[PDB]
Design a protein around this ligand. Structure first.
Ligand SMILES: O=C(O)c1ccc(N2C(=O)c3[nH]nc(-c4ccccc4)c3[C@H]2c2ccc([N+](=O)[O-])cc2)cc1
Ligand SMILES: O=C(O)c1ccc(N2C(=O)c3[nH]nc(-c4ccccc4)c3[C@H]2c2ccc([N+](=O)[O-])cc2)cc1
Lengths: 31, 229, 229, 31
């Protein structure tokens, strides 16, 4: 539900699914 | 006289996941209605709409920007410049969407707010999209954002803490977004952590659902992340 | 002379998940190059690009159309008509994307195909987007599609069965899409089930990876679904 | 991977996630 309701979740879902080896962006949970 | 068709045409746009058009199916709702007391249904559709449109841009932004950093780490100006100009298009798009909702929120939505929770939602919403501007802006516009954000969030907080119960979704949601504003935009982790726990504790003593439960979990996750490195 | 920047600007558009622009970053690749032998990288980017753009439309289509059926089931003409006209916009969009790739595929891509697998891919691709048209069209255009599709897929099959090994990804992928074409468009489950198992069996005796493995599983799933009700 | 690579998977992922009670559309797996 975190990747379904927050920007942080969707970003981390996309970045891991695309195999992009760039360093993890700092972000916090917000609605 | 029948503005109910646009309510129906936006539910389709949501269902088909075409969000930019749902915004248009909701811009009409606020204007054709004129200046009426806007319902719970249409508000959430407007909320969901603009949030999903912006969300799609910020996601693009935060990815593009993070690719640009791994490129400045190698010093490839011919690569970075093309990334940045592409980001320029996204930043330009973002500006317009915010410069679309805010004065529409200003013109027909903030003035026509009756109940206690309605005023908090819309003011929180104002503070939100102002904060969304602060993410990418640099100049005098950036300072104006952080200022307009701080004033809007505090204006909402006063009504939220007093008029609404500590376990009310938006009172925590406001507190959650207010909490990120300090940490992300104002770079002061101190005042952020304090407001985060304070809104959490008061909601705990009240506990004694669904939407409220989820937001508390986001607060706790932020604290544990804001106390890591 | 440097068309490599558009290869780089499309990888960004993919990464940021802005697919309609990646198409444009790839339309330039085929044209600025002129008529050159197109690489494995740029082809897959063009494939992924147009497929993702179309995919987003077909998803919208199949949802909208399925809402329209639950509405004709109640006979609400005032509801159905607004759904249909919205579908009219999506169908119009779909037409243009197909009418964009196909003659571009015709002009610079099919004629300049050298190797055995290259000709199969592009012809399969032609058969694909022609089939994508057949999904929503009705009139003389619909018949022209099913015809152009059948001819393109069979033209590809002849090269695929002979020039390439039974376990080669596109030889099965073609067979998979060819198999759906019969069941979905031509409404004949018989010739579909036969081609599906035939391409499966020949790939099995060969087995003795990754991309090929996945497609076989889709074939088996279709058979078990085409023999249910 | 089925909702990540096929139209059928993505459609069935979206339709279930949105709580839409309309009857399941007939579709087959294609790439
Ligand atoms: O940005 C989003 O993607 C989004 C938008 C609306 C919602 N909301 C709901 O799903 C929902 N259910 N009930 C309400 C609601 C409506 C009127 C008053 C109070 C709650 C909502 C909204 C919703 C939930 C929580 C917050 N909040 O405190 O940040 C705002 C909007 C959640 C997320
Ligand atoms: O429609 C899509 O979303 C899509 C697009 C490209 C791919 N492809 C890959 O991920 C991939 N990896 N290697 C290849 C490849 C490239 C040149 C020759 C053979 C394989 C691909 C393509 C891909 C895989 C399978 C098929 N197919 O047989 O339907 C087409 C394109 C998969 C799905």
């Amino acid at each position: 539900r975190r990747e379904l309701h927050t920007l942080k979740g969707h970003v981390e879902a996309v970045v891991k699914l695309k195999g992009l080896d760039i360093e993890t962006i700092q972000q916090s949970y917000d609605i | 006289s029948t503005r109910e068709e646009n309510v129906y045409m936006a539910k389709l746009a949501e269902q088909a996941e075409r969000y930019e058009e749902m915004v248009e199916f909701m811009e009409k709702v606020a204007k054709t209605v004129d200046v009426e007391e806007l319902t719970v249904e249409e508000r959430n559709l407007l909320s969901v709409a603009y949030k999903n449109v912006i969300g799609a841009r910020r996601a693009s932004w935060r990815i593009i920007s993070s690719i640009e950093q791994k490129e400045e780490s190698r010093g490839n100006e011919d690569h970075v410049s093309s990334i940045k100009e592409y980001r320029g298009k996204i930043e330009a798009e973002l500006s317009k969407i915010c410069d679309g909702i805010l004065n529409l929120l200003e013109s027909h939505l903030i003035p026509v707010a009756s109940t206690a929770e309605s005023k908090v939602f819309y003011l929180k919403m104002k503070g939100d999209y102002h904060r969304y501007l602060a993410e990418f802006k640099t100049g005098a516009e950036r300072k104006e954002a952080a200022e307009n954000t701080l004033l809007a969030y505090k204006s909402a907080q006063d009504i939220a803490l007093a008029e609404l119960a500590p376990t009310h979704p938006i009172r925590l949601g406001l507190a959650l977004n207010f909490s990120v504003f300090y940490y992300e935009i104002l770079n002061s982790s101190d005042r952020a952590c304090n407001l985060a726990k304070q809104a959490f504790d008061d909601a705990i003593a009240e506990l004694d659902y669904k939407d409220s439960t989820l937001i508390m979990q986001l607060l706790r996750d932020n604290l544990t992340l804001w106390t890591s490195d």
